[PDB]
Design a protein around this ligand. Structure first.
Ligand SMILES: C[C@@H]1CCN(C(=O)CC#N)C[C@@H]1N(C)c1ncnc2[nH]ccc12
Length: 279
């Protein structure tokens, strides 16, 4: 699980987010271009707060073992003990947002429900580890195959101490505001139940095939003082994203429950899973 810097050969960018980037590299210790492709995350530049967070992220992912969480492979170092890069499995079908847009006409509602169930199970597992994800969105889901997706980034994830079932951040966060639960917008509170809110938005993303014209940003902005206050207002009045075109009624009802105003009245991932499998 220790990868030597000198054997990581840089090929291409796979994505970026939250002060980090993921690159496609070949781990090629023979130097003949036959080594395994890996996905390698690093900070885009040096930062002391970001480095502390990055080491924590690595320890979170290292301790996750699930069919629905991207596989941790190891780390590369540089000044010891200074983690330079997080090495993960590379899954070439890539991000679910991109995959849905491209294969839209090939994937039916059963496939979307399968993806929904897999994401829900990943999240049930995450919450069992006292991990709050905080950034659940289709952009952070990875496609292993046409019938298998995995939660694939943990840049903002936090571990809940044993005696507190939420965490409050000091500043407002810097993620697109359209996945945030009301209590995160109003009071920077995050919990496993704000993850459920975000999962409702992920269901919306799936059933819109991440179409840009009716995306959470496009549609909320169209429906919508500062933007965050307008969105909070809109949400506090009980307005919600509209059912996606052709959305099964049962799924739309599940989204609405995920979007209960109060965190306590949202269903658990434990409860959602069986309901998704039933559908
Ligand atoms: C959807 C995956 C998680 C989010 N991504 C980031 O780059 C976040 C940052 N920084 C892209 C990544 N993705 C395109 C991947 N694509 C292919 N293999 C991958 N392994 C691990 C991630 C990954």
């Amino acid at each position: 699980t220790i990868f030597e810097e000198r054997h990581l050969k840089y090929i291409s960018q796979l994505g970026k987010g939250n002060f980090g980037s993921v690159e496609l590299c070949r781990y090629d210790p023979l130097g003949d271009n036959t080594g395994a492709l890996v996905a390698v995350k690093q900070l885009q530049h040096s930062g002391p707060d970001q480095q502390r967070d990055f080491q924590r992220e690595i320890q979170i992912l290292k301790a996750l073992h699930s069919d629905f969480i991207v596989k941790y492979r190891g780390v590369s170092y540089g000044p010891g003990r200074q983690s330079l890069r997080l090495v993960m499995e590379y899954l070439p079908s890539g991000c679910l947002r991109d995959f849905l847009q491209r294969h839209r006409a090939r994937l039916d509602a059963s496939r979307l429900l399968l993806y929904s169930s897999q994401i829900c199970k990943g999240m049930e597992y995450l919450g069992s580890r006292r991990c709050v994800h905080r950034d659940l969105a289709a952009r952070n889901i990875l496609v292993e195959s046409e019938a298998h997706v995995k939660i694939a980034d943990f840049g903002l994830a936090k571990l809940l101490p044993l005696d507190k079932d939420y965490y409050v951040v000091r500043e407002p966060g810097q993620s697109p505001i359209f996945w945030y639960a009301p209590e995160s917008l109003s009071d920077n509170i995050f919990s496993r139940q704000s993850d459920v809110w975000s999962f409702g938005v992920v269901l919306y993303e799936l059933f819109t095939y991440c179409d840009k014209s009716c995306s959470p940003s496009a549609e909320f902005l169209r429906m919508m003082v500062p933007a965050l206050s307008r969105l909070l207002e809109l949400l506090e009045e009980g307005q919600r994203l509209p059912a996606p075109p052709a959305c099964p009624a049962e799924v739309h009802e599940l989204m609405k429950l995920c979007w209960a105003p109060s965190p306590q009245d949202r269903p658990s991932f434990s409860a959602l899973g069986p309901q998704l499998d039933m559908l």
